[PDB]
Amino acid sequence: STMKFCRECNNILYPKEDREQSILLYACRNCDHQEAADDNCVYRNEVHHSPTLPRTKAVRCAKCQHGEAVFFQATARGEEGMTLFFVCCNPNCGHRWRE
Amino acid sequence: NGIVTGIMVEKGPKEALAFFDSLQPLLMEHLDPQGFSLSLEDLSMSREDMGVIHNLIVREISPMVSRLRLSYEDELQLENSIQKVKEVAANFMLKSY
Ligand SMILES: [Zn+2]
Ligand SMILES: [Zn+2]
Reported structure resolution in angstroms: 3.6
| A89 has binding-site annotation | no
b/e burial code for range B12-51 (CB count within 10 A of at least 16 → b): eeeebeeeeeeeeeeeeeeeeeeeeeeeeeeeeeeeeeee
The CB density around residue A91, as the number of other CB atoms within 10 Å, is 11
For residue A61, count other CB atoms closer than 10 A to its CB.
19
Compute the distance between CA of residue B32 and CA of residue B66 in angstroms, rounded to an integer. Answer: 55
Q: Which residues of A touch B77 (CB under 8 A)?
A: 57
Contact A90 B70 (CB under 8 A): no
Is A9 marked as binding a ligand?
A: yes
A71: distance to nearest CA of chain B, Å?
15
Instruction: Return the residue of B nearest to A51 by Cα.
Output: B71
Between CA B3 and CA B14 the distance in angstroms is 14
Task: Inspect the interface and report whether the beta carbons of B71 and A90 lie closer than 8 Å.
Answer: no
Are A31 and A24 contacting, i.e. CB atoms less than 8 angstroms apart? Answer: no
Technique employed here was cryo-EM
Instruction: Pick the ligand that lies closest to the CA of residue A95.
Output: 2
> In whole angstroms, how far apart are CA B10 and each of A7, B4, B5?
112, 10, 9
